[PDB]
């Protein structure tokens, strides 16, 4: 039973919706990343 | 049950209910407007009874497939030859047996509006 | 409401003086001596449940009906508040 | 318990007040509405059906020398009740006529026999100087409510057919409040009152609905 | 121990709840029309019901 | 019996339906706050029992719990893998379940705002019967929103 | 940001984020989405104010033959604009989807366009305490947005690589002939912080793939099913 | 209506009087047999519908259909309380704990 | 009797200005700060808003909720002041006897005219 | 007229349209409604009352090797119906020793006479690679709707009591036509139609209502 009533469905909704959390421990928590790079933002940030 | 029943039927005329009484009962002009002699289409189901045990013919006809109720304009006997429909009669009858005799509700409850 | 409550206001000059009498009586109408009610004949307030007909354990209701039989009395009367025990004494 | 306490008050001719207590949550109205639906209908009744007033030619006219009018006397006649003391009595024509300055009651009509008048007085009319009021009226045993559709022949010309209320019983109603004499407070409480007395006693009206209600079920 | 009495006790309870009113209150409270009192008539379940008008 | 039947060894057996007003973790404490009372020493000697020095002092189901246990968990000291409060020993932890069903009340409120409460649940019998069966399961009268 | 998320004690202080919000370098300031009528979506932050814009309303193959392109710049919406050219758009005249306005929680609502803010407010909060049910018949009318509320919330499980389940079911979903042998153990009713306890019943046997695999708390076939839909009838009854 | 019309019946008396309502009520337009009057009454409304308690159908066009009936966390069981003198909270001089 | 939106509006449980909202078109909403928008709202619920109408009407549907809920911030902590003042006021004694009296005005003026 | 023509077209363990013809304007629903009332009410039906898995303690659990769970198999059992071909039966215990890779329908239970299963298939469970579904279930004749209050004892340990739906008749309705000659097209036409056959024939269902309706109609005799 599929009575789709949606017109022109371009780009899907911004996934995975829970990006605020991902961009929280991936932007700040530069743990799973070689110390060779990475600026600040997070640990290495307040650390320096 | 008091928002008028005027469903707009037109405006015919009968020589005291002998013409547009049976003919109009077939098509056009039901029980709304139409004036005759003085009153109107009120002449159809004269609820007799009296102030003895409430209007019998009134609530009795309503129960069956007669009076559509919901205030369809009908002549009762209550205390005088009125025009109040059996619908309002119920209200006055509810408050009547409730407290004691319609004597109080009669002079209190309005009818014009 | 209460069976003939409006009639209770007419007597008492105040709605508050009525309540006092209702309880003041109930204090010496069932607790003091269940045999002090003026209403004993067929006017005796009774209940009718699944079992049968019995006198309601509540006396506050009796007062409203007891203060309607025309009997009893209220107001500033008999200064000795310790004399009530004397009158109640005769009633065992 | 299982066997309920069917209590009845009975005031005499009118208003009885029948009450049942123990039942089942969902029956209070199951066996209360069906009954009142038989009362208002199929019941060996009796009432006025046709009438004929001299001098007059219709219903929307007036009787000279009479305070009231055709339609008036007609209405008051609808409340009148009779009783057929013999099963072998289809209908019974009545005749009226009496003095001048008097309020012709109901007992002033034809003092027959096979029929009796329960309700005395019954206004009717109040003629004065006009010593005329000769009006023929036919009665007949019916069932429920039947307006002016049967025609009411008889005289053939000027026998203005009046509504028929040959249903001793009239306005009826009941109620239902949950008690708890037995167990849970979910149980019901019948209590059906018959505010009428058209010719039959309130008690007989009940046993007549319960009875007729059975035969129709025996059809299965 | 919630032995589920539901026997006779529910009867004696009626004698106590006979003509004995109870004070029902509403939170928050506003004006004198925020308390009032009625007569407890134990029904079924647990939900406590009241007359509609009183809501106003 | 209410004890030895569904208690034993202390903690209640798993998968044992328990109701409010029952034991779950009957712990014994030598905590003697109230010594023997005068006239109390009589009712204590009258019967076949003696005195006491531990008192009942148990958990006792809270005012509402008619279900069953899914499983327990004994977390006493002697285990360095449990960060517990100093001086504390044996931290019983049980999980009690219970089916909800549906009595009277509760809030429905769909996805628009029309919220209400269950008044009375009339058993089939009544309720608007469609001209082909399927009696109206729920009635949503207006007023309010 | 939506306009029907708060409650009472704390209004404006507690709301929610949009569905098409929080992207790119969100680390600093929020940035929405804007279509150029052509296959492409830019993110020029919220401060955007280039050649106004238009909300998703009446389209016609890139160049809507509306003539009065419903525009909305800053505050009020000056009738329209319509550059009257085959160009992309009014710098960013496109909302892509009407879900960008309300929160991903409000868009779930079926006919969200016939009620008031306050009215829809309470109902919106009801989806926060709808107490899951083993039934979950799933509401008849449901937007195609719940298709992600079942996986993103990780309420249910997933399926990696190939298929071939050969599921044994029970309380431990089998493995898949995709890469290795990994048994997927259910939460076993787990435990809730609000005293609810959610369960996850599977739905497979022998072998199958596409990519749902076993539902979750209050769901049914990847379809978010909070409450339960049942035949109702509007009418008064004795006063109940 | 297809099932009914083919089940061995069609249009009911109690389902006919209801039309006399909409007729004057301005709801359903007067014209052909009750078949169409019951059709348009379904598009924006529902079937006559009756009452299992009383006995007679609800005089008037009533609406019926499936929508959505949820259930909030707040119930009744864990939202009720009752006590007597049992409660007490020494030092605070009030029933607590 | 068909239209219930009026059956309650007249006198039962309905608001008159609540009608002009549904079948109406009400859109004379004012900006969040203070300035009635340009083009109103294409209400007519039956037809979904242009996705902008609801976002524009919300600006005014915000003060209608924060104000009522803000009736516990200051206004709610003001009623206490009322109960404190009048406290020992109780109807007692019997006939005090006071000369000076107040004459309530049967007609008031209108600043306009 | 007088004596009507009570016709009945039973389909055989379901449906069963009963139609009456001559009556009186105002009785077509006076006799109909009251009956349907009784059907979906006081009627000696049959249904499950208590079960007992094996390695499972209580409902709040799961049966290893089974696709479904305790609560699941329990729910599906509520829709199972059995007949008692003997009025001397008070309650019959049933056994179900399912095997491996199968669906375990309803007819796979204990093939015992005295009781029949008028509802094949009935997806109860679907265990595979478990080989263990031994579950004892009791079934007794009741009347109405009784939840888990009659604590189905029996095992006296893990016999998790399941809701009872003894009621045989479900979902009922009727109509009233008008075309039974006689005289005056004002007559009515009763034509009730039971749409269910829990465990009792449609016909019996009717006679039951009419009978019990009489027992409750006789109370309206002697007053007080």
Swiss-Prot record, chain C:
Pfam families: RNA_pol_Rpb6. Belongs to the RNA polymerase subunit omega family. It is an enzyme of class 2 (transferase). The gene is rpoZ. This is DNA-directed RNA polymerase subunit omega. The RNAP catalytic core consists of 2 alpha, 1 beta, 1 beta' and 1 omega subunit. When a sigma factor is associated with the core the holoenzyme is formed, which can initiate transcription. It catalyses: RNA(n) + a ribonucleoside 5'-triphosphate = RNA(n+1) + diphosphate. One of its GO terms (molecular function) is DNA binding.
From Swiss-Prot, chain D:
Its EC number is 2.7.7.6. It comes from the Bacteria. The gene is rpoA. It is an enzyme of class 2 (transferase). Homodimer. The RNAP catalytic core consists of 2 alpha, 1 beta, 1 beta' and 1 omega subunit. When a sigma factor is associated with the core the holoenzyme is formed, which can initiate transcription. This is DNA-directed RNA polymerase subunit alpha. Residues 1-220 are annotated as: Alpha N-terminal domain (alpha-NTD). One of its GO terms (cellular component) is DNA-directed RNA polymerase complex.
Curated annotation (Swiss-Prot), chain G:
The RNAP catalytic core consists of 2 alpha, 1 beta, 1 beta' and 1 omega subunit. When a sigma factor is associated with the core the holoenzyme is formed, which can initiate transcription. DNA-dependent RNA polymerase catalyzes the transcription of DNA into RNA using the four ribonucleoside triphosphates as substrates. Belongs to the RNA polymerase beta chain family. This is DNA-directed RNA polymerase subunit beta. It comes from Thermus aquaticus.
From Swiss-Prot, chain I:
Belongs to the RNA polymerase beta' chain family. DNA-dependent RNA polymerase catalyzes the transcription of DNA into RNA using the four ribonucleoside triphosphates as substrates. Zn(2+) 2 binds at residue 96. The RNAP catalytic core consists of 2 alpha, 1 beta, 1 beta' and 1 omega subunit. When a sigma factor is associated with the core the holoenzyme is formed, which can initiate transcription. This is DNA-directed RNA polymerase subunit beta'.
């Amino acid at each position: 039973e599929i009575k789709r009533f949606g017109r022109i469905r371009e780009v899907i909704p911004l996934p995975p919706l829970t990006e605020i959390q991902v961009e929280s421990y991936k932007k700040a928590l530069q743990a799973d990343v070689p110390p060779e790079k990475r600026e600040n933002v997070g640990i290495q940030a307040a650390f320096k | 049950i008091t928002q008028v029943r005027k469903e707009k039927k037109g405006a015919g005329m009968a020589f005291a209910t002998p013409e547009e009484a049976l003919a109009a009962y077939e098509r056009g002009e039901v029980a709304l407007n139409a004036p005759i002699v003085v009153a109107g289409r009120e002449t159809s189901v004269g609820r007799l009874k009296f102030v003895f045990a409430n209007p019998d013919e009134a609530l009795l006809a309503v129960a069956h497939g007669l009076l559509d109720l919901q205030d369809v304009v009908t002549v009762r006997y209550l205390g005088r030859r009125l025009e109040t429909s059996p619908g309002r009669i119920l209200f006055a009858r509810i408050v009547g047996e409730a407290v004691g005799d319609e004597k109080v509700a009669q002079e209190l409850i309005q009818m014009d509006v | 409401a209460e069976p003939g409550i409006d009639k209770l206001f007419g007597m008492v000059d105040s709605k508050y003086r009525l309540t006092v009498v209702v309880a003041k009586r109930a204090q010496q109408l069932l607790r003091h001596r269940f045999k002090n009610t003026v209403l004993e004949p067929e006017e005796r307030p009774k209940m009718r449940t699944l079992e049968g007909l019995y006198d309601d354990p509540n006396a506050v209701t009796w007062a409203m009906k007891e203060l309607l039989t025309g009997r009893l009395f209220f107001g500033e009367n008999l200064v000795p508040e310790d004399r009530l025990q004397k009158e109640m004494e005769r009633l065992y | 318990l299982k066997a309920p306490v069917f209590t009845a008050t009975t005031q005499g001719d009118h208003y009885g007040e029948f009450v049942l207590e123990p039942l089942e949550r969902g029956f209070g109205v199951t066996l209360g509405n069906p009954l009142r639906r038989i009362l208002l209908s199929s019941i060996p009744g009796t009432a006025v059906t046709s009438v004929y007033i001299e001098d007059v030619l219709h219903e929307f006219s007036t009787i000279p020398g009479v305070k009231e009018d055709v339609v008036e006397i007609i209405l008051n006649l609808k409340e009148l009740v009779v009783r057929f003391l013999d099963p072998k009595m289809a209908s019974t024509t009545l005749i009226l006529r009496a003095e001048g300055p008097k309020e012709v009651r109901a007992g002033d009509f034809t003092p027959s026999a096979d029929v009796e008048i329960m309700n005395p007085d019954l206004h009717i009319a109040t003629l004065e100087e006009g010593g005329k009021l000769y009006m023929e009226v036919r009665v007949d045993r019916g069932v429920g409510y039947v307006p002016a559709e049967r025609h009411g022949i008889k005289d053939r010309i000027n026998a203005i057919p009046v509504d028929a209320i040959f249903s001793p019983v009239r306005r009826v109603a009941f109620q239902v409040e949950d008690t708890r004499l037995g167990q849970r407070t979910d149980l019901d409480k019948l209590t059906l009152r018959i505010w009428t007395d058209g010719s039959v006693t309130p008690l007989e009206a009940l046993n007549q609905a319960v009875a007729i209600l059975k035969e129709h079920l025996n059809y299965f | 121990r919630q032995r589920d009495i539901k026997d006779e006790v529910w009867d004696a309870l009626e004698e106590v709840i006979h003509g004995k009113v109870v004070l029902l209150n509403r939170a928050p409270t506003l004006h004198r029309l925020g308390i009032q009192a009625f007569q407890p008539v134990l029904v079924e379940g647990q939900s406590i019901q009241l007359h509609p008008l009183v809501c106003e | 019996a209410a004890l030895r039947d569904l208690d034993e060894e202390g903690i209640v057996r798993i998968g044992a339906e328990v109701k409010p007003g029952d034991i779950l973790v009957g712990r014994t404490s030598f905590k003697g706050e109230q010594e023997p009372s005068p006239e109390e020493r009589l009712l204590r000697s009258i019967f076949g029992e003696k005195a006491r020095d531990v008192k009942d002092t148990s958990l006792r189901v809270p005012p509402g719990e008619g279900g069953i246990v899914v499983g327990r968990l004994r977390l006493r000291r002697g285990d360095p893998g449990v960060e517990l409060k100093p001086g504390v020993r044996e931290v019983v932890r049980v999980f009690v379940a219970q089916k909800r069903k549906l009595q009277v009340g509760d809030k429905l409120a769909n996805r628009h705002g029309n919220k209400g409460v269950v008044a009375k649940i009339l058993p089939v019998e009544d309720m608007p019967h469609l001209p082909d069966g399927t009696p109206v399961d729920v009635i949503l009268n207006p007023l309010g929103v | 940001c939506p306009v029907e998320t708060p409650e009472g004690a704390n209004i404006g202080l507690i709301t929610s984020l949009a569905a098409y919000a929080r992207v790119d370098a969100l680390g600093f300031i929020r940035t929405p989405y804007r279509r150029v009528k052509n296959g492409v979506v830019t993110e020029e932050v919220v401060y955007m104010t280039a050649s106004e814009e238009d909300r998703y309303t009446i389209a016609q193959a890139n160049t809507p033959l509306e003539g009065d392109r419903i525009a909305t710049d800053r505050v009020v919406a000056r009738r329209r604009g319509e550059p009257v050219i085959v160009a992309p758009e009014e710098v960013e005249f496109m909302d892509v989807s009407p879900k960008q306005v309300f929160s991903l929680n409000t868009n779930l609502i079926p006919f969200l366009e016939h009620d008031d803010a306050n009215r829809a407010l309470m109902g919106s909060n009801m989806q926060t305490q709808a107490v899951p049910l083993i039934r979950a018949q799933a509401p008849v009318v449901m937007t195609g947005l719940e298709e992600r509320v079942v996986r993103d919330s990780l309420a249910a499980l997933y399926a990696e690589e190939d298929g071939e389940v050969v599921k044994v079911d029970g309380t431990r979903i089998a493995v898949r002939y995709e890469d290795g042998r990994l048994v997927h153990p259910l939460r076993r009713y787990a435990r809730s912080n609000q005293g609810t306890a959610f369960d996850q019943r599977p739905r497979v046997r022998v072998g199958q793939r596409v990519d749902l695999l076993a539902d979750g708390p209050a769901s049914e076939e990847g379809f978010l099913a909070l409450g339960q839909n049942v035949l109702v009838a509007i009418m008064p009854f004795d006063g109940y | 209506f297809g099932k009914r019309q083919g089940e061995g019946f069609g249009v009911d008396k109690r389902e006919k009087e209801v039309l006399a309502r909409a007729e004057k009520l301005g709801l359903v337009s007067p014209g052909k047999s009750p078949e169409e009057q019951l059709k348009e009454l379904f598009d924006l409304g529902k079937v006559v519908l009756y009452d299992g308690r009383t006995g007679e159908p609800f005089e008037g066009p009533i609406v019926v259909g499936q929508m959505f009936i949820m259930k909030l966390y707040h119930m009744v069981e864990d939202k009720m309380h009752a006590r007597s003198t049992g409660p007490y909270s020494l030092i605070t001089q009030q029933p607590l704990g | 009797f068909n239209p219930l939106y009026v059956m309650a509006q007249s006198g039962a449980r309905g608001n008159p200005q609540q009608i002009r909202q549904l079948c109406g078109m009400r859109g004379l909403m004012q900006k969040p700060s203070g300035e009635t928008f340009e083009v109103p709202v294409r209400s007519s619920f039956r037809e979904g808003l242009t996705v902008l109408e609801y976002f524009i009407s919300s600006h005014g549907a915000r003060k209608g909720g924060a104000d009522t809920a803000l009736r516990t911030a200051d206004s709610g902590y003001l009623t206490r002041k009322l109960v404190d003042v009048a406290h020992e006021i109780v109807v007692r004694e019997a006939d005090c006897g006071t000369t000076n009296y107040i004459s309530v005005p049967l007609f008031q003026m209108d600043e306009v005219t």
